[PDB]
Amino acid sequence: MEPLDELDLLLLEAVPRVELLRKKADALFPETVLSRGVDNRYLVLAVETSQNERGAEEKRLHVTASQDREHEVLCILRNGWSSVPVEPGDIVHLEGDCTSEPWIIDDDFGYFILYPDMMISGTSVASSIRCLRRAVLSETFRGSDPATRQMLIGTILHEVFQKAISESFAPERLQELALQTLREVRHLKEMYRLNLSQDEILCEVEEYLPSFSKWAEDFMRKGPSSEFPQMQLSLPSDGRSSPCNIEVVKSLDIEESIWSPRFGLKGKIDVTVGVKIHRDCKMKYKVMPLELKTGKESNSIEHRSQVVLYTLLSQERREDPEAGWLLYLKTGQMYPVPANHLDKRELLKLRNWLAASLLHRVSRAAPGEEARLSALPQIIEEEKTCKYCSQIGNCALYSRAVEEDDASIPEAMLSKIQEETRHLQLAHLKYFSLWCLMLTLESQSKDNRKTHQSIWLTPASELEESGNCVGNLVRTEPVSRVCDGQYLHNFQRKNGPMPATNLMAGDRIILSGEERKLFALSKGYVKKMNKAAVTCLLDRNLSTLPATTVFRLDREERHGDISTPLGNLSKLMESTDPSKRLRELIIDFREPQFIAYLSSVLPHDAKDTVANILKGLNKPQRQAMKRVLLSKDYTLIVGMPGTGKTTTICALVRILSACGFSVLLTSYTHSAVDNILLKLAKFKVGFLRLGQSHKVHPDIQKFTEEEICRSRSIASLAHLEELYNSHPIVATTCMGINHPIFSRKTFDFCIVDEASQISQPVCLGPLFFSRRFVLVGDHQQLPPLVVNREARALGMSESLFKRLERNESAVVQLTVQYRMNRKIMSLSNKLTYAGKLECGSDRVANAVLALPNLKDARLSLQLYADYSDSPWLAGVLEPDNPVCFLNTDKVPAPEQVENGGVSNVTEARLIVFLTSTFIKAGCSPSDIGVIAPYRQQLRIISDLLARSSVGMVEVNTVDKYQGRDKSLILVSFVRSNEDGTLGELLKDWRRLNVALTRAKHKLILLGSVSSLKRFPPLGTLFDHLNAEQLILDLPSREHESLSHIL
Ligand SMILES: Nc1ncnc2c1ncn2[C@@H]1O[C@H](COP(=O)(O)OP(=O)(O)O)[C@@H](O)[C@H]1O
Ligand code: SF4
């Protein structure tokens, strides 16, 4: 903007601007429908402040509930509402009634719900009264309130009381309930975690119990209504003065789980109760929310506010209860909490700021330029609140790693921040700060930002046709229990039939009812799947309204996955000796040490056993074992394809075991960890498997903590502790580091399988409990998946394995492979592994595809085709031609583009033929893998294969094929285009590599050389394929052979 002239012409003034905001809201809230009435969703278009009275702020909002940009509705926020931080492009909901006419919301009328699909927990909202920062930090570093003793006592009491209210408050029965519940594995675990006495906890819990009885005698007495406790309860309901008499009749519901699209609130109502309010000689009956509190009898604002929010939650399910109850089990003293409009308003205003703070996490600085982490809500001046925070750790830490001549942040706190973060170096802070930034961006990616609107706005049918919304279902079969909050249910349709789609038994599913009034309820996972019925395990028992009730099941999306990574990052920053050690080895790249071999590096007694184990192993394997044994810090085992990383890890574990080391065995997937374990079972090496026995492989389930417990009926801290110390080897996944075992045990060694696939901050986790570690991986194979472009660009896809690989001292390669025949090996060897792979034997080397009856299959195919078009088919089927590229050039084989995805029906039809041929040539479908790069193309190939009713071969992307192999791999590359649209995906070297290494005996590759050559990995492949003349050009679709397929 120089000349007079630019200024002139740079004067704008609506249409691209309005549309750019629709894009803006779609970034964070994809597919927000926009609506009128009860569940209104309005898109903000314009925001300004004005002056009424004199010096009185108003906020002038221009909003729309429709996409046609002439449906503009005006809106004025007054008093405290005017200060809510709405910018344009936000999605809002006016719960202050209306939509009929929004106009004015102020002190005395209306609620404004900023980012309504963002359902924040009321407890976090209450927390933020005192400190908004503390709340945000709570929401995001979820583990930095460690489980205290009181929290344990707290849970136990809540639970006893819930059990009591459905039964009796008679002291012997309360004592019984206390006795039973103190023995539940769940609580034993926590006692274990906290190294507490079982009996001491029992004792402490027992002292509360007479209060339980006093309360029940007071309120649940069944006498004259004169004689119930007497208090003022000023409701909406007309007349609100004069005392009245309170009778709790029954508990109606316990742990009522409520999600509010209306207020952007979620909550769990401890106990829902039937209450009779007695008024002179008349009575009113109200279903009301009661919160149990295990601390001091504070009647704090936090505590009351909580209950106020529970009243709002309630409206999602029933009539507005107007008030709620605080119990304080310590004393048996119930307090009324009335939902005043002032409260409901004050809290919902504060709730907005919380939603804003949790959403406005990455800053541009110039709408388009590189990312920053947005600074959190500022540090308070209330130096008393601070004192006892626990979040102070992360607060000081977030401050120092992301802050700003200034500060002017309280100087009694400015020193605490330094005490807390004096142990850390600049590198460390930089590392923390970046890893958050990356994680946040990843978390905020559009894909993992879908709202629950599908569940509560569009009904059952419209959604079942795809994705997952199975829903016209009733239950009648009695609900079984399993343990605590894992109830087994059984559902099927009204009247008769009805379908399936993408709803595979194992899936995370959310179970709502029919009507909007029964949304949320219970969440869980699927057990089995008939097309007559559906069994799933849930956290809630669901009796309350039988028969009449229709239920919808739906899918899900986390992203708040980022809690675990964030945890590990926070733990890394702690000043403990293990965290220092990891800081230096990881952040500071301190060189790992290895000692030189001596006679007694191993316990004398281990040596025969170790020598035997070694003698089983190929040389680089032995070299690997040596490096681990000589390690002082860590070892990196490179598991090149087919080299037997599962056989190797088992061997290491056997050697370490023989040496009298404790080993923590971890991986990314349950499958991978279980595979190693299955091998170890054979060798009769003992181990305990942590994790959920349904996610654990069938034959390992016997070794599970879950199974062992139920099996051997473990009902004492000592017997649980016995099980925990029963095995030197403990096996879990990288995510399962939250187990109470890691509160109390450390290990000589941690081993991480698939270290190269696991995201770096996740991989970090099990290491905190290990003295020396071993990462197993191959960076030539797939990296951790990083969806967000920008994040990927900052280094987010660098596995911990690769990071540490820059110390070659620590790296040992597994190079002798047992998967590929020399021809198939030769490929990946020339392309990727710089000639380092060798065959495990001549057997492996010379193996060609098992095809028992080519003879009559070659004939049956000539019943339409030709023998004079042997060019390809003969070269394709010939087992002695193990590598083969089929060029879809002289037949046109065009790609089709449909909404983000790519397909190719020519290639699809082509491989489906080839598959059918090879099964008919005697290769079983089980031994066959189909690989395509495009999600969309896989669908087409599955369909076409079902059409040919040969369905037993798997079609998939490389991801779902890592460290598995098939005897015959077939690859449709799908890209085939005029000379334009060029993938990002095919450009990837590693993905190609995985594709070329899944095949044992026959590899078949199919795509258009013309367009494929434009991708470097493919370009180079074509070069090596030309040297051996392995490209075979397909004839025209006209030609006799192809004609009948197309
Ligand atoms: N040192 C070795 N000597 C002989 N065969 C081996 C050796 N290491 C691995 N193998 C073979 O290689 C194959 C691959 O190992 P396996 O653990 O079954 O799957 P993967 O290692 O590919 O996960 C096995 O069938 C195994 O017999
Ligand atoms: S420490 Fe004080 S300021 Fe930092 S979060 Fe906790 S409360 Fe808010």
Residue numbers in the entry: 1 to 13, 20 to 245, 248 to 412, 415 to 1056
How do the authors describe this structure?
In addition, the structure reveals an OB (oligonucleotide/oligosaccharide-binding) fold domain N-terminal to the nuclease domain, and a β barrel domain that occurs between the nuclease and helicase domains and which is held in place by a stalk of two long alpha helices. The β barrel and helicase 1A domains pack on top of the nuclease doughnut and extend the cylinder and central tunnel. The OB domain decorates the exterior of the nuclease domain, and is uninvolved in DNA binding.
It is a ssDNA endonuclease that requires a free end for cleavage, and does not cleave dsDNA, single-stranded gaps, D-loops or RNA.
